[PDB]
Amino acid sequence: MNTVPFTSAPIEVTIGIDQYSFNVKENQPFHGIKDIPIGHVHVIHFQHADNSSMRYGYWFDCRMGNFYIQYDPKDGLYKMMEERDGAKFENIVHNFKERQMMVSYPKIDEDDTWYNLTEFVQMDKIRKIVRKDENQFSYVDSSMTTVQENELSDPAHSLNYTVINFKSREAIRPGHEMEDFLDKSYYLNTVMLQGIFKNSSNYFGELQFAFLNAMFFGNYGSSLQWHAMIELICSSATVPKHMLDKLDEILYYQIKTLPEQYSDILLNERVWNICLYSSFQKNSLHNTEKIMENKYPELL
Amino acid sequence: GAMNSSNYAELFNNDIKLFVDDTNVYRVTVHKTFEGNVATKAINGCIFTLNPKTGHLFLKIIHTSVWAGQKRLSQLAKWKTAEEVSALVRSLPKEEQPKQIIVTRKAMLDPLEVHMLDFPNIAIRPTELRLPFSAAMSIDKLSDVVMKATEPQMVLFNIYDDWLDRISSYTAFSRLTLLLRALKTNEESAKMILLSDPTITIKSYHLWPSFTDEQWITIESQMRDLILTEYGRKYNVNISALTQTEIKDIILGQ
Ligand SMILES: CN1c2ccc(N)cc2O[C@H]1O
């Protein structure tokens, strides 16, 4: 069980760790998060009490290094850093645990929620979407734009999601205009799966990462990407049976986890109505359709 | 974005543009079967592609063979329209290609945009104008070439005949829209008004009669009265009661 120690907490902040969150007071003797489950990516995230515009965080994987958080009073945020000295780090963590100054990652034994949200998400794929090669962890915030949003301005600070555009030469074979526009199977199976993602696991990983950035940071471009990747499957007549069964499970847990009070801003009425009631796959997402109908019947 | 009353002069500037109307592409007669079910029988159709500045009409005849063994024909008709418009643009020399294509029906936007992806600098626009181009098939010579076609055919016409020798494109378009609005509201009455005086003929190379400037004023008046007479006949409205502002508004209204 891994640990992300904090140097200190000089400013009042709501701290998220995956789907959990807790309030830290200004100069509260808080020195980090312990018992973080090995085997998954994690996200530690922040919303300052004095300024909710500051909404930002770090994707990391404790298998890849020893990470800690330290507040920077110049840049005015909690920063993730890597400690290269194994023995200094172990000695820091042991002291803070002895003095019981760390919150425990509060996982219920029965509860597979985080696995179910991150099943296909891999740090090496995150680091290609979020390019900062000198760090093993990835910073995301509420304001970061996507490569696609920036084409319609700083490229170093962008989310490099795979561009999906239904009215693009990439999406439409010369001479198959109506066929490819009304049935996106070509675009899904040949261009995106075989061509760009190489397999459904990489496709689902990016879809799951987009959803989590939408949910945790209110990142608008991430929300657009999540819905585009759902719509591209639902608008294809020809999808492998395993991919439809897996998508239904993925979306079920995403809709289950979404805070009820954010449904209005995080869910696109048109895409969901089209996907569940009009698309080729309208009858292929049993679990998703039942949770959406019971939790968000107004949207539909 | 959308072409409307506010940006009407733009039709007559020097940027090449085409209107595309797809309302006569897929045409059927609905009938009873021997077993008392209902069936459709397709008849020949046409794409109405018009340069409003020059009067140049690209009439692509849609032969019923196009539909043979195809499903969801009203959907296919939009895509076939977009395919043929795309083929027409690619057939034109670069300096003759339109800078904008205005579709008379919003359902044509996605099909045309997808067929014209190769032409990113050609703008595909809807219009807020209610244009009476559906009445094209009430023009005898256009109806005749469509119904006689035995194969796919493109036929080129000038829908203004020689009017541009005497009037501006703005006035020529206004005359065309008034004639087509009249043909659309009461075809019998419109044809009577245009073809009653047998001394005024249609030249072999023209669509409309050879009216003098003064006769066009009389014709145009008779068309506006017909649209009002019919608008009265429709809504049960004493038209002899209406003022000239009241009257002006209803023609443009429609
Ligand atoms: C020169 N004309 C012309 C060229 C192209 C089309 N479609 C029509 C035309 O009517 C003629 O006036």
Contact A177 B82 (CB under 8 A): yes
Query: Whole-angstrom Cα distance, residue A174 to residue A2?
Result: 53
- Look at chain A and report how many structural domains it folds into: 2
CATH of the domain at A177: 1.25.40.550
Domain of residue A63 covers 1-143
HSE-CB of B30 using CA atoms within 13 angstroms: 2
Q: Which of A87, A113, A143 is the last residue of a domain?
A: A143
The answer to whether the Cβ–Cβ distance between B117 and A178 falls below 8 Å is no
Cβ of B206 below 6 Å from ligand 1: no
Where residue A134 sits, what CATH number does that domain have?
A: 2.60.34.20
Record the resolution, in angstroms: 1.5
> Residue-wise over A44-68: b if at least 16 C-beta within 10 A, else e?
bbbbbeeeeebbbbbbbbbeebbbb
Residue with tokens 């049960």: B236
Q: Count CB pairs under 8 A between chains A and B.
A: 24
A167:B110 CB<8 A: yes
Identify the helix (H) or strand (E) that includes residue B175.
Answer: helix B169-185
Q: Which of A143, A166, A183 is the last residue in one of the domains?
A: A143
Give the SS3 label for residue B20: strand
Measured from the Cα of B156, ligand 1's closest atom is: 7
Whether ligand 1 lies within 6 angstroms of the CB of B67 is answered as no
- Angle (CA) B225-B227-B229 rounded to 5° is 60
Taking alpha carbons only, the member of B74, B87, B57 closest to residue B152 is B87
Q: Which chain B residue lies closest to A165 (C-alpha atoms)?
A: B114
CA gap A155, A146 in Å, rounded: 9
Same domain as A161, residue A125: no
Candidates A177, A186, A235: best to mutate against B (most CBs of B within 10 A) is A177
- Check B117 against A172: CB less than 8 A apart: yes
Cβ atoms of A9 and A27 closer than 8 Å: yes
Final residue belonging to a domain, choices A91, A122, A143: A143
H helices of chain A, in order, are 86-98, 113-118, 123-129, 147-151, 177-182, 185-186, 200-217, 220-234, 241-257, 263-266, 269-273, 286-295
Ligand 1 atom having least distance to the Cα of B58: 7
